[PDB]
């Protein structure tokens, strides 16, 4: 469902991940949270075009890919951390031709260059771990 979906979340993106398709995720990080993940998955393989992994221990926003069975190299640079324990966040994820563009609370968070060139393979949005979702629009 769109409002208050429980975690873990499993959303079927109908007709694949489309260029210009925007995902909105509004949620809350618990005081006790250590980690949660948002994966843009291809179901057949289990490959992940984009794994976004906020980790509260170090306050990192980890981005990586799981392609051909292997983890790529991690991208971590941010200008802000919207995922502090006990915080609400509003994430807007846009799938561009060349990159994902992610904004948190209307402020740019990161861009992630496509590693899976064929982004249309992605038909699975997965959100899992220590996060409470108020709203997910796919
Ligand atoms: C053990 C574990 O946590 N496994 C998770 C897995 O996480 C890995 C992922 O976050 C990558 C991204 O780069 O980092 C891995 O940690 C690395 C450190 O970041 C790095 O500094 C160090 O040098 O090396 C570490 C090891 O590689 C981290 O382990 O993430 C995947 C994707 O979400 C998880 O798979 C999913 O698991 C859920 C249940 O939790 C479901 O079973 C799903 O089917 C599956 O996609 C995995 O559990």
UniProtKB/Swiss-Prot annotation:
The modification Phosphoserine is found at residue 73. This is Galectin-4. Keywords: Lectin, Phosphoprotein, Repeat. A beta-D-galactoside binds at residues 71-77. Coiled coil: none annotated. Contains two homologous but distinct carbohydrate-binding domains. It comes from Homo sapiens (Human). One of its GO terms (molecular function) is galactoside binding. The keyword Cytoplasm does not apply. One of its GO terms (cellular component) is cytosol. GO terms for biological process: antibacterial peptide biosynthetic process; cell adhesion. Monomer.
């Amino acid at each position: 469902p769109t409002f208050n979906p429980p975690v873990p979340y499993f959303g079927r993106l109908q007709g694949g991940l489309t260029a210009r398709r925007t995902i909105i995720i509004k949620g809350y990080v618990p005081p006790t949270g250590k980690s949660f993940a948002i994966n843009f998955k291809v179901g057949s393989s289990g490959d992940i075009a984009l794994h976004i992994n906020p980790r509260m221990g170090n306050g990192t926003v980890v981005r990586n890919s799981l392609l051909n069975g292997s983890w790529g190299s991690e991208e971590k640079k941010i200008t802000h951390n919207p995922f502090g324990p006990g915080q609400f966040f509003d994430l807007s994820i846009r799938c561009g031709l060349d990159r994902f563009k992610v904004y948190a609370n209307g402020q740019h968070l990161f861009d992630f260059a496509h590693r899976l060139s064929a982004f249309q393979r992605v038909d699975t949005l997965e959100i899992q771990g220590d996060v409470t979702l108020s709203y997910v629009q796919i």
